């Protein structure tokens, strides 16, 4: 609809993504004469981003999901952002048939609330990402939600992804068939920046 | 008689690989190369059985087909399910971004 | 795949229902001579429930849709059934980072709880229902979901049927073409007998 | 020749009333007696257009099929979306009821 000839296939901005399924002919891989740092990190410039970016992961070693649940609820305890409004609206006031002086007690109000709020909270996992050879910086850091339990009461809804931002990455193109002519170019690579509960 | 050999053959799943330079979208997509995207064709008449996957509607139009062909078509062998493949590509103003592009390749198909 | 050979469509259990199109050629309509109560009665027997059934339904005389939230809203005050496990099963007890020795209070417990109740209770209302000439009795009591707000928090879901029974009331069948021999016999007519709250 | 004249005209919804005495399913079916239930057919050539309502896949196989028609066929105008109809029937035990039948109207087609 905003394209009248649909003769190529749109592109969509859900997330999350599965990445590249790269072709393994070695004439596409960037070889090490502009393999190096230096210019790469020129190139990139302003792009560079160390919180985001990396040639070396610190996710790296000196069962692991009971620990993901845990991580999930802990991050959940202190949820980011104000309070949602439709949470924040709530007075829990309508009692007795729609209605007492007060069903519950102002104490117990944010309280109720701020448990409604951490369960309901959909953190943003993080993770490296290795994005390859054909990529610079190689090793990415990549958002996620949690899927492992419902955000909802009562159970059904999920957490999915609801904002994004993009990195701004380089990319070793090859113009002709066969990898001749190739070079680093911006790519814009997606991550995950917010989380929200869904149906 | 100008068309496929898909007449005795039921509704099914077929390999086709794309490869982007032949269809001249090199110049918009710069990876993957190509992707296996797979199509479906055969037939779907009566009577049809579960393996076909049909929707009511096809079934009533099968029916309909048997008896009076000249009233409506045999219903067609078509996806029920595709998935996403993630593209690199120029965009509008030129820039390159990466996303997914959904409903690109079959995983199955049915009498629609 | 429960049916090998798929040649005819098959019939699905999703509620609720839109009733028959029915074609208005006066044939089929049942005339004046075995359109008489008392063998009517008799014919459908113990099938006969007054409290779903009627010649003449009480929903008559002697907008209307904020009445429909008002009702809904003091029918969710007092939810029938047990209390959910789901709900039941909530002690609002992990509070510092995954708890305190208690992050709420017990009496805080069950109002927390019978909040969440009323707010995801979805109940079911009633309405008398014209089946027209051809079904005798001819008005029915039919059930349904309350689907004008969200069941959930957060707001997502919605109430949708869950359960269901069947009502036995008579239909006038015509075997030949035209509407030729004619009568009544049993059918099983599907009524909304629980909602609850769903994406 | 073989076919119904579809060639010209492009993927679009048409309609057909379906009468169960006609498929012989009036002693399964009392009532209704019969439905609008409507069919697609037409052309899903290459170019295809946003009223086409075509998916990813099928775009990209038009494509492939306008450049060796040989690869692949084109793809087909199917339903896009359908409507329940209620049925009053007699079941396996032979018990009369009411039912939703799912899928049995067409209300929109496309190139799948
Ligand atoms: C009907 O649906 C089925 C599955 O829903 C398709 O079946 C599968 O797909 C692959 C083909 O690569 C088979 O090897 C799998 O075993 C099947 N799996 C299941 C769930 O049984 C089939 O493609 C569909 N029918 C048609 C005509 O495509
Ligand atoms: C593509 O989709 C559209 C709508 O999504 C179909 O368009 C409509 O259906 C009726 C036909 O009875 C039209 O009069 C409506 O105005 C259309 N409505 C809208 C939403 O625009 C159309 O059938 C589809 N294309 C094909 C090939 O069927």
Same mark, same amino acid.
């Given at each position: 609809?905003?394209?009248?000839?649909?003769?190529?296939?749109?592109?969509?901005?859900?997330?999350?993504?599965?990445?590249? @399924?790269?072709?393994?002919?070695?004439? =596409?891989?960037?070889?090490? $004469?502009?393999?190096?740092?230096?210019?790469?990190? !020129?190139?990139?410039?302003?792009? +560079?981003?160390?919180? =985001?970016?990396?040639?070396?992961?610190?996710?790296?070693?000196?069962?692991?999901?009971?620990?993901?649940?845990?991580?999930?609820?802990?991050?959940?305890?202190?949820? !980011?952002?104000?309070?949602?409004?439709? @949470?924040?609206?709530?007075? =829990?006031?309508?009692?007795?048939?729609?209605?007492?002086?007060?069903?519950?007690?102002?104490?117990?109000?944010?309280?109720?609330?701020?448990?409604?709020?951490?369960?309901? =909270?959909?953190?943003?996992? +993080?993770?490296?990402?290795?994005?390859?050879?054909? %990529?610079?910086?190689? +090793?990415?850091?990549?958002?996620? *939600? %949690?899927?492992?339990? #419902?955000?909802?009461?009562?159970?059904?809804?999920?957490? $999915?992804? !609801? $904002?994004?931002?993009?990195?701004?990455?380089?990319?070793?193109?090859?113009?002709?068939?066969?990898?001749?002519?190739?070079?680093?170019?911006? @790519?814009? +690579?997606? @991550?995950? !920046?917010?989380?929200? *509960? #869904?149906? | 008689?100008?068309?496929?050999?898909?007449?005795?053959?039921?509704?099914?799943?077929?390999?086709? /690989?794309?490869?982007?330079?032949?269809?001249?979208?090199?110049?918009?997509?710069?990876?993957?190369?190509?992707?296996?995207?797979? /199509?479906?064709?055969?037939?779907?008449?009566?009577?049809?059985?579960?393996?076909?996957?049909?929707?009511?509607?096809?079934?009533?139009?099968?029916?309909?087909?048997?008896?009076?062909?000249?009233?409506?078509?045999?219903?067609?062998?078509?996806?029920?399910?595709?998935?996403?493949?993630?593209?690199?590509?120029?965009?509008?103003?030129?820039?390159?971004?990466?996303?997914? /592009?959904?409903?690109?390749?079959?995983?199955?198909?049915?009498?629609?």
């Amino acid at each position: 609809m905003q394209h009248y000839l649909h003769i190529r296939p749109a592109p969509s901005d859900n997330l999350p993504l599965v990445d590249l @399924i790269e072709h393994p002919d070695p004439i =596409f891989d960037p070889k090490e $004469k502009d393999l190096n740092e230096t210019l790469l990190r !020129s190139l990139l410039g302003g792009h +560079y981003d160390p919180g =985001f970016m990396a040639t070396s992961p610190p996710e790296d070693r000196p069962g692991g999901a009971e620990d993901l649940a845990e991580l999930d609820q802990l991050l959940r305890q202190r949820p !980011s952002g104000a309070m949602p409004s439709e @949470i924040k609206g709530l007075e =829990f006031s309508e009692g007795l048939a729609q209605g007492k002086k007060q069903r519950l007690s102002k104490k117990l109000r944010r309280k109720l609330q701020m448990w409604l709020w951490s369960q309901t =909270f959909c953190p943003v996992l +993080y993770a490296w990402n290795d994005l390859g050879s054909r %990529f610079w910086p190689r +090793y990415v850091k990549v958002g996620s *939600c %949690f899927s492992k339990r #419902s955000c909802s009461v009562p159970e059904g809804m999920v957490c $999915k992804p !609801s $904002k994004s931002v993009h990195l701004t990455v380089l990319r070793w193109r090859c113009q002709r068939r066969g990898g001749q002519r190739c070079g680093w170019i911006p @790519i814009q +690579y997606p @991550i995950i !920046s917010e989380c929200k *509960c #869904s149906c | 008689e100008n068309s496929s050999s898909d007449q005795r053959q039921a509704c099914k799943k077929h390999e086709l /690989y794309v490869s982007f330079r032949d269809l001249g979208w090199q110049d918009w997509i710069i990876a993957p190369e190509g992707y296996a995207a797979y /199509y479906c064709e055969g037939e779907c008449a009566f009577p049809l059985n579960s393996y076909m996957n049909a929707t009511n509607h096809a079934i009533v139009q099968t029916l309909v087909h048997f008896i009076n062909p000249e009233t409506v078509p045999k219903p067609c062998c078509a996806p029920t399910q595709l998935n996403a493949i993630s593209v690199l590509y120029f965009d509008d103003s030129s820039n390159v971004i990466l996303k997914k /592009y959904r409903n690109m390749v079959v995983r199955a198909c049915g009498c629609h």
